[PDB]
């Protein structure tokens, strides 16, 4: 079943809770929380990093993600791709171009969520294996 107007409203609600100043962006690390903070079906519940890394989420430097990119991606997760989706994109881009008059959030894409995430979780694995080797070496002396 499709998406009610209620759903969009709740989206913009928690969006405000993560974006008080209406910069229309959100930080890389806060994304996961945002995905967790939605009602179904938009909701991507934790753990969700591998799920989030699978959607097209361009980031502008420095590691910020735009609202509309998240809206498109998150609604596409649900629908997903179709002709009705294209029309819905027309509507979303229009409604956004309405409720937002300025050009302050218009900044060019520099990477994608997936790249940053690949770096971060690579690091996580590295530091982990390093602590492991150190532990093994301290244990080595008995």
């Amino acid at each position: 079943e499709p998406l009610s107007e209620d759903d969009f409203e709740m989206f913009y609600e928690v969006w405000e809770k993560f974006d008080p100043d209406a910069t229309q962006f959100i930080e890389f690390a806060k994304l996961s929380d945002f995905a967790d903070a939605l009602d179904p079906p938009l909701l991507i519940a934790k753990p969700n990093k591998v799920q989030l890394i699978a959607m097209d989420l361009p980031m502008v430097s420095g590691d910020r993600i735009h609202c509309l990119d998240i809206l498109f991606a998150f609604t596409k997760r649900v629908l997903g791709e179709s002709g009705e989706m294209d029309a819905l994109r027309i509507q979303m881009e229009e409604r956004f171009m309405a409720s937002n008059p300025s050009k302050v959030s218009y900044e060019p894409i520099t990477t994608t969520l997936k790249r940053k995430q690949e770096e971060v979780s690579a690091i996580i694995i590295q530091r982990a294996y390093r602590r492991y080797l150190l532990k093994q070496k301290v244990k080595k002396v008995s």
């Binding site: 097209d56 294209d86 956004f96 171009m97 060019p108 894409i109 994608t112 997936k114 790249r115």
Partner: protein, 148 residues
């Protein structure tokens, strides 16, 4: 300080840095530090960008027949829709030209040999279309002069 863009290089998935030369030719080079590969990426619209070679103050653009060229003036043909493909590479298509029936975009691209392809021949899902920007600085820009 009206439009908040960036100054970058654009790395081709085909293995080249995108290069806009003084004679106005566009291709790919393996010269790491060619000064002819820095670009002004300027946000002229919602997820839309203009790509201008710094050393030549030239805009990349695409005409009605799909041929990629350079313009000293800022036409609406100098506007590119940016979007990522498979959350890993950035693609740039024309804002005004498409299949018209199928709606598929005409994209900025390079073949395997680093030469510039016709817009309509570059498919968004082929490596030819794929770029990864490698930025140098953020930068503010004066919103440019629209023409015909």
């Amino acid at each position: 300080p009206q439009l908040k863009g960036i100054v970058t290089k654009l790395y081709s998935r085909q293995g080249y840095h995108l290069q806009l030369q003084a004679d106005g030719t566009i291709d790919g080079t393996k010269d790491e530090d060619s000064t002819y590969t820095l670009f002004n990426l300027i946000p002229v619209g919602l997820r839309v960008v203009a790509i201008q070679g710094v050393q030549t103050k030239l805009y990349l653009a695409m005409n009605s027949e799909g041929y990629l060229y350079t313009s000293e003036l800022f036409t609406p043909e100098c506007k590119f829709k940016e979007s990522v493909f498979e959350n890993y590479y950035v693609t740039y298509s024309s804002m005004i030209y498409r299949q018209q029936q199928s709606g598929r975009g005409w994209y900025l691209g390079l073949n395997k040999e680093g030469e510039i392809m016709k817009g309509n021949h570059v498919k968004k899902n082929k490596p030819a279309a794929h770029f990864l920007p490698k930025p140098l600085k953020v930068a503010m820009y004066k919103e440019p002069s629209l023409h015909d």
